[PDB]
Homo-oligomer: A and B are copies of this chain.
Amino acid sequence: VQMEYEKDVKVAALDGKKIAVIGYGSQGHAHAQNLRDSGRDVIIGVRPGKSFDKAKEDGFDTYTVAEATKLADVIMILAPDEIQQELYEAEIAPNLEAGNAVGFAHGFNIHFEFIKVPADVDVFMCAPKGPGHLVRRTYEEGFGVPALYAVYQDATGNAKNIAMDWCKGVGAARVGLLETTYKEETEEDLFGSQAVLCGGLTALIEAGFEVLTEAGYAPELAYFEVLHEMKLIVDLIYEGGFKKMRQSISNTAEYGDYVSGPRVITEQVKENMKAVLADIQNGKFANDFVNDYKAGRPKLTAYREQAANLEIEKVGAELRKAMP
Protein backbone atom coordinates (compact mmCIF):
# COMPACT_ATOMS: atom_id res chain seq x y z
CA VAL A 1 0.00 0.00 0.00
CA GLN A 2 1.35 3.45 -0.93
CA MET A 3 0.62 6.77 0.77
CA GLU A 4 -1.65 9.08 -1.23
CA TYR A 5 -1.96 12.87 -1.19
CA GLU A 6 -4.10 15.65 -2.63
CA LYS A 7 -2.95 14.87 -6.18
CA ASP A 8 -4.37 11.35 -5.80
CA VAL A 9 -7.93 12.60 -5.07
CA LYS A 10 -9.24 12.18 -8.60
CA VAL A 11 -12.88 13.26 -8.23
CA ALA A 12 -14.20 16.16 -6.17
CA ALA A 13 -17.02 13.82 -5.22
CA LEU A 14 -18.40 15.96 -2.40
CA ASP A 15 -19.16 18.81 -4.87
CA GLY A 16 -22.85 19.63 -4.52
CA LYS A 17 -23.45 17.15 -1.70
CA LYS A 18 -25.34 18.06 1.45
CA ILE A 19 -23.14 16.72 4.26
CA ALA A 20 -24.53 15.90 7.70
CA VAL A 21 -22.05 15.34 10.52
CA ILE A 22 -23.80 13.33 13.23
CA GLY A 23 -22.46 14.26 16.65
CA TYR A 24 -20.58 17.37 17.72
CA GLY A 25 -17.96 16.04 20.10
CA SER A 26 -14.26 16.63 19.59
CA GLN A 27 -14.31 14.49 16.44
CA GLY A 28 -17.63 15.69 15.03
CA HIS A 29 -16.62 19.31 15.63
CA ALA A 30 -13.30 18.99 13.81
CA HIS A 31 -14.65 17.20 10.74
CA ALA A 32 -17.53 19.65 10.28
CA GLN A 33 -15.47 22.79 10.86
CA ASN A 34 -12.68 21.60 8.56
CA LEU A 35 -15.01 20.63 5.72
CA ARG A 36 -16.75 24.02 5.95
CA ASP A 37 -13.42 25.87 5.83
CA SER A 38 -12.54 23.73 2.79
CA GLY A 39 -15.72 24.82 1.00
CA ARG A 40 -18.31 22.08 1.57
CA ASP A 41 -21.96 22.25 2.64
CA VAL A 42 -22.09 20.95 6.21
CA ILE A 43 -25.05 20.79 8.56
CA ILE A 44 -25.04 19.23 12.04
CA GLY A 45 -27.39 16.66 13.53
CA VAL A 46 -27.47 15.82 17.24
CA ARG A 47 -29.90 15.38 20.10
CA PRO A 48 -30.95 18.59 21.89
CA GLY A 49 -28.45 19.68 24.50
CA LYS A 50 -25.09 21.37 24.88
CA SER A 51 -23.79 19.97 21.59
CA PHE A 52 -26.89 21.22 19.76
CA ASP A 53 -26.54 24.82 20.86
CA LYS A 54 -22.76 24.86 20.67
CA ALA A 55 -23.27 23.86 17.04
CA LYS A 56 -26.09 26.38 16.57
CA GLU A 57 -23.77 29.07 17.96
CA ASP A 58 -20.80 27.86 15.90
CA GLY A 59 -22.87 28.80 12.84
CA PHE A 60 -24.18 25.40 11.70
CA ASP A 61 -27.66 24.64 10.44
CA THR A 62 -28.36 22.25 13.32
CA TYR A 63 -31.22 19.72 13.34
CA THR A 64 -32.10 16.54 15.18
CA VAL A 65 -30.32 13.33 14.17
CA ALA A 66 -33.39 11.88 12.46
CA GLU A 67 -33.97 15.05 10.44
CA ALA A 68 -30.42 16.02 9.53
CA THR A 69 -30.23 12.54 7.97
CA LYS A 70 -33.39 13.36 6.00
CA LEU A 71 -31.68 16.42 4.53
CA ALA A 72 -28.24 15.07 3.64
CA ASP A 73 -26.58 13.18 0.81
CA VAL A 74 -23.55 12.23 2.99
CA ILE A 75 -24.08 11.23 6.65
CA MET A 76 -20.88 10.88 8.72
CA ILE A 77 -21.53 9.24 12.09
CA LEU A 78 -19.18 10.51 14.80
CA ALA A 79 -20.82 9.25 17.99
CA PRO A 80 -19.34 6.73 20.46
CA ASP A 81 -19.34 3.09 19.37
CA GLU A 82 -21.69 2.05 22.18
CA ILE A 83 -24.57 4.36 21.17
CA GLN A 84 -24.20 4.11 17.37
CA GLN A 85 -26.44 1.05 16.94
CA GLU A 86 -29.37 2.52 18.88
CA LEU A 87 -28.87 5.94 17.25
CA TYR A 88 -28.77 4.30 13.80
CA GLU A 89 -31.84 2.08 14.08
CA ALA A 90 -33.96 4.78 15.69
CA GLU A 91 -32.94 8.00 13.94
CA ILE A 92 -30.68 7.29 10.93
CA ALA A 93 -31.92 4.14 9.16
CA PRO A 94 -35.54 5.32 8.58
CA ASN A 95 -34.24 8.49 6.85
CA LEU A 96 -31.76 7.10 4.31
CA GLU A 97 -32.44 7.33 0.59
CA ALA A 98 -30.99 5.09 -2.11
CA GLY A 99 -27.72 6.64 -3.25
CA ASN A 100 -26.87 8.32 0.04
CA ALA A 101 -23.41 7.70 1.54
CA VAL A 102 -22.90 6.87 5.25
CA GLY A 103 -19.47 7.46 6.82
CA PHE A 104 -17.71 6.27 10.00
CA ALA A 105 -14.33 7.10 11.48
CA HIS A 106 -13.94 3.64 13.04
CA GLY A 107 -15.08 0.37 11.61
CA PHE A 108 -16.24 -1.46 14.76
CA ASN A 109 -20.00 -1.43 14.33
CA ILE A 110 -20.04 -2.02 10.55
CA HIS A 111 -17.32 -4.67 10.57
CA PHE A 112 -18.85 -6.70 13.39
CA GLU A 113 -22.28 -6.13 11.79
CA PHE A 114 -23.98 -4.51 14.75
CA ILE A 115 -25.12 -2.02 12.08
CA LYS A 116 -26.08 -3.11 8.53
CA VAL A 117 -26.67 -0.32 6.00
CA PRO A 118 -29.04 -0.99 3.04
CA ALA A 119 -27.25 -2.21 -0.09
CA ASP A 120 -28.29 0.84 -2.14
CA VAL A 121 -26.39 3.19 0.22
CA ASP A 122 -22.61 3.65 0.26
CA VAL A 123 -20.56 3.06 3.42
CA PHE A 124 -17.12 4.65 3.64
CA MET A 125 -14.54 5.51 6.27
CA CYS A 126 -12.10 8.31 6.85
CA ALA A 127 -10.14 7.61 10.02
CA PRO A 128 -7.69 10.36 10.98
CA LYS A 129 -4.87 9.10 13.17
CA GLY A 130 -5.24 11.83 15.76
CA PRO A 131 -7.66 13.31 18.27
CA GLY A 132 -10.37 15.76 17.33
CA HIS A 133 -8.67 18.89 18.63
CA LEU A 134 -5.56 17.96 16.64
CA VAL A 135 -7.50 17.25 13.43
CA ARG A 136 -9.06 20.73 13.75
CA ARG A 137 -5.90 22.57 14.87
CA THR A 138 -3.49 21.16 12.26
CA TYR A 139 -6.03 22.11 9.59
CA GLU A 140 -6.33 25.65 10.98
CA GLU A 141 -2.53 25.90 10.82
CA GLY A 142 -2.40 24.69 7.22
CA PHE A 143 -1.50 21.02 7.35
CA GLY A 144 -3.36 18.13 8.95
CA VAL A 145 -3.46 14.65 10.45
CA PRO A 146 -2.82 11.52 8.30
CA ALA A 147 -5.80 9.25 7.78
CA LEU A 148 -6.98 5.85 6.60
CA TYR A 149 -9.85 5.49 4.17
CA ALA A 150 -11.90 2.43 3.31
CA VAL A 151 -15.16 1.47 1.64
CA TYR A 152 -17.37 -1.31 3.08
CA GLN A 153 -20.03 -1.24 0.37
CA ASP A 154 -20.12 0.73 -2.87
CA ALA A 155 -23.60 0.94 -4.35
CA THR A 156 -23.20 4.12 -6.43
CA GLY A 157 -19.67 3.52 -7.73
CA ASN A 158 -18.72 6.83 -6.09
CA ALA A 159 -17.97 5.52 -2.60
CA LYS A 160 -14.17 5.58 -2.88
CA ASN A 161 -14.15 9.06 -4.43
CA ILE A 162 -16.38 10.22 -1.56
CA ALA A 163 -14.00 8.78 1.06
CA MET A 164 -10.90 10.34 -0.48
CA ASP A 165 -12.54 13.75 -0.97
CA TRP A 166 -13.72 13.59 2.63
CA CYS A 167 -10.12 13.03 3.75
CA LYS A 168 -9.04 15.87 1.48
CA GLY A 169 -11.74 18.12 2.89
CA VAL A 170 -10.70 17.53 6.53
CA GLY A 171 -7.02 18.19 5.76
CA ALA A 172 -5.78 14.60 5.88
CA ALA A 173 -4.73 14.50 2.23
CA ARG A 174 -2.33 17.37 2.93
CA VAL A 175 -0.11 14.99 4.92
CA GLY A 176 -0.89 11.44 3.74
CA LEU A 177 -3.60 8.81 3.17
CA LEU A 178 -3.47 5.00 3.35
CA GLU A 179 -6.19 2.87 1.79
CA THR A 180 -7.39 -0.01 3.95
CA THR A 181 -10.49 -2.18 4.52
CA TYR A 182 -13.10 -2.01 7.27
CA LYS A 183 -11.89 -5.41 8.46
CA GLU A 184 -8.19 -4.44 8.51
CA GLU A 185 -8.75 -1.04 10.11
CA THR A 186 -11.04 -2.42 12.81
CA GLU A 187 -8.88 -5.43 13.69
CA GLU A 188 -5.49 -3.64 13.55
CA ASP A 189 -6.71 -0.62 15.53
CA LEU A 190 -8.23 -2.81 18.24
CA PHE A 191 -5.16 -5.04 18.41
CA GLY A 192 -2.77 -2.09 18.46
CA SER A 193 -4.45 -0.31 21.34
CA GLN A 194 -5.14 -3.52 23.30
CA ALA A 195 -1.78 -5.26 22.88
CA VAL A 196 0.65 -2.32 22.60
CA LEU A 197 -0.48 1.32 22.82
CA CYS A 198 -2.93 1.23 25.74
CA GLY A 199 -3.26 -2.19 27.38
CA GLY A 200 0.27 -3.47 26.92
CA LEU A 201 1.87 -0.11 27.70
CA THR A 202 0.02 0.65 30.93
CA ALA A 203 0.46 -2.94 32.12
CA LEU A 204 4.21 -2.80 31.36
CA ILE A 205 4.59 0.49 33.25
CA GLU A 206 2.55 -0.80 36.19
CA ALA A 207 4.51 -4.06 36.44
CA GLY A 208 7.80 -2.17 36.42
CA PHE A 209 6.52 0.17 39.15
CA GLU A 210 5.45 -2.85 41.22
CA VAL A 211 8.80 -4.56 40.82
CA LEU A 212 10.68 -1.44 41.97
CA THR A 213 8.42 -0.57 44.91
CA GLU A 214 8.07 -4.17 46.11
CA ALA A 215 11.87 -4.41 46.07
CA GLY A 216 12.03 -1.36 48.39
CA TYR A 217 12.91 1.47 45.99
CA ALA A 218 11.47 4.96 46.44
CA PRO A 219 8.15 5.22 44.55
CA GLU A 220 8.74 8.87 43.66
CA LEU A 221 11.90 7.87 41.80
CA ALA A 222 10.14 4.81 40.37
CA TYR A 223 7.50 7.13 38.87
CA PHE A 224 10.25 8.90 36.92
CA GLU A 225 11.97 5.73 35.74
CA VAL A 226 8.89 3.88 34.42
CA LEU A 227 6.48 6.70 33.39
CA HIS A 228 7.72 10.31 33.36
CA GLU A 229 10.77 9.65 31.22
CA MET A 230 8.72 7.61 28.75
CA LYS A 231 7.46 10.77 26.99
CA LEU A 232 10.91 11.76 25.72
CA ILE A 233 11.71 8.19 24.70
CA VAL A 234 8.49 7.88 22.70
CA ASP A 235 8.87 11.39 21.24
CA LEU A 236 12.21 10.21 19.83
CA ILE A 237 10.75 7.02 18.36
CA TYR A 238 7.92 9.07 16.86
CA GLU A 239 10.41 11.39 15.16
CA GLY A 240 13.09 8.91 14.12
CA GLY A 241 12.28 5.33 15.08
CA PHE A 242 14.19 3.07 17.44
CA LYS A 243 17.39 4.31 15.78
CA LYS A 244 17.03 7.95 16.82
CA MET A 245 15.91 7.03 20.35
CA ARG A 246 18.86 4.70 20.89
CA GLN A 247 21.39 7.32 19.79
CA SER A 248 20.09 9.90 22.28
CA ILE A 249 20.09 7.62 25.34
CA SER A 250 23.34 6.64 27.09
CA ASN A 251 25.33 3.70 25.79
CA THR A 252 24.53 2.02 29.12
CA ALA A 253 20.79 2.43 28.56
CA GLU A 254 21.08 1.39 24.90
CA TYR A 255 23.03 -1.73 25.80
CA GLY A 256 20.45 -2.58 28.46
CA ASP A 257 17.69 -2.09 25.86
CA TYR A 258 19.16 -4.74 23.55
CA VAL A 259 19.99 -7.19 26.29
CA SER A 260 17.03 -6.89 28.60
CA GLY A 261 14.10 -6.07 26.30
CA PRO A 262 14.01 -9.64 24.97
CA ARG A 263 14.16 -11.07 28.49
CA VAL A 264 11.00 -9.15 29.45
CA ILE A 265 8.95 -9.48 26.26
CA THR A 266 9.51 -13.13 25.36
CA GLU A 267 8.16 -15.56 22.78
CA GLN A 268 5.45 -16.36 25.32
CA VAL A 269 4.44 -12.68 25.39
CA LYS A 270 4.13 -12.81 21.61
CA GLU A 271 1.89 -15.89 22.03
CA ASN A 272 -0.21 -13.88 24.51
CA MET A 273 -0.60 -11.15 21.90
CA LYS A 274 -1.73 -13.76 19.37
CA ALA A 275 -4.55 -14.83 21.67
CA VAL A 276 -5.59 -11.18 22.00
CA LEU A 277 -5.65 -10.92 18.21
CA ALA A 278 -7.70 -14.12 17.96
CA ASP A 279 -10.42 -12.71 20.22
CA ILE A 280 -10.54 -9.60 18.08
CA GLN A 281 -10.86 -11.58 14.85
CA ASN A 282 -13.49 -14.02 16.16
CA GLY A 283 -15.83 -11.36 17.55
CA LYS A 284 -15.41 -12.42 21.20
CA PHE A 285 -13.94 -9.10 22.35
CA ALA A 286 -16.58 -7.13 20.46
CA ASN A 287 -19.41 -9.15 21.99
CA ASP A 288 -17.78 -8.87 25.43
CA PHE A 289 -17.63 -5.07 25.17
CA VAL A 290 -21.20 -4.72 23.87
CA ASN A 291 -22.52 -7.11 26.53
CA ASP A 292 -20.78 -5.21 29.32
CA TYR A 293 -22.33 -2.01 28.00
CA LYS A 294 -25.84 -3.50 27.81
CA ALA A 295 -25.52 -4.79 31.40
CA GLY A 296 -24.75 -1.29 32.69
CA ARG A 297 -20.91 -1.47 32.37
CA PRO A 298 -20.23 -3.56 35.53
CA LYS A 299 -16.74 -4.69 34.40
CA LEU A 300 -15.80 -1.19 33.28
CA THR A 301 -16.98 0.16 36.64
CA ALA A 302 -14.77 -2.24 38.59
CA TYR A 303 -11.76 -1.62 36.34
CA ARG A 304 -12.12 2.14 36.69
CA GLU A 305 -12.41 2.06 40.49
CA GLN A 306 -9.44 -0.34 40.71
CA ALA A 307 -7.37 1.96 38.48
CA ALA A 308 -8.23 4.97 40.66
CA ASN A 309 -6.61 3.20 43.66
CA LEU A 310 -3.27 2.36 42.00
CA GLU A 311 -0.29 3.66 43.95
CA ILE A 312 1.42 4.86 40.76
CA GLU A 313 -1.64 7.02 40.07
CA LYS A 314 -1.63 8.54 43.57
CA VAL A 315 2.14 9.11 43.68
CA GLY A 316 1.94 10.36 40.10
CA ALA A 317 -0.78 12.91 40.81
CA GLU A 318 1.21 14.33 43.74
CA LEU A 319 4.40 14.57 41.69
CA ARG A 320 2.64 16.16 38.70
CA LYS A 321 1.09 18.67 41.10
CA ALA A 322 4.60 19.52 42.35
CA MET A 323 5.86 20.10 38.74
CA PRO A 324 3.60 22.86 37.25
Contact = CB atoms under 8 A, between A and B. Distances in A.
Contact of A270 (B207, B259, B276): B207
Interface stretch (A39-47, A160-168, A220-228): A220-228
A320 B241 contact: yes
A9 to B, nearest CB: 16
A178 to B, nearest CB: 6
A15 interface: no
Given A241-B317, A255-B300, A275-B263, A224 B190 contact: no
Interface stretch (A53-61, A91-99, A151-159, A230-238): A230-238
Contacts of A130: 229, 232
Interface in A30-50: none
Interface in A136-190: 146, 148, 175-176, 178, 180, 184-185, 187-190
Nearest to A262: B203
A11 interface: no
B269 A207 contact: yes
A237 to B, nearest CB: 6
A310 B273 CA distance: 19
B256 A199 contact: yes
B229 A129 contact: yes
B195 A208 contact: yes
A12 interface: no
Interface of A: 1, 3, 26, 80-82, 106, 108, 129-131, 134, 146, 148, 175-176, 178, 180, 184-185, 187-208, 210-212, 215, 217-218, 220-222, 224-235, 237-243, 245-246, 248-266, 268-270, 272-277, 285, 288-289, 292-293, 299-300, 303-304, 307-308, 310, 312-313, 316-317, 319-320, 322-324
22 contacts: A80-B251, A82-B251, A129-B229, A131-B248, A184-B218, A191-B225, A192-B208, A196-B204, A196-B205, A197-B225, A199-B256, A199-B258, A201-B204, A201-B230, A202-B245, A203-B262, A211-B270, A227-B241, A256-B285, A256-B289, A259-B299, A268-B268
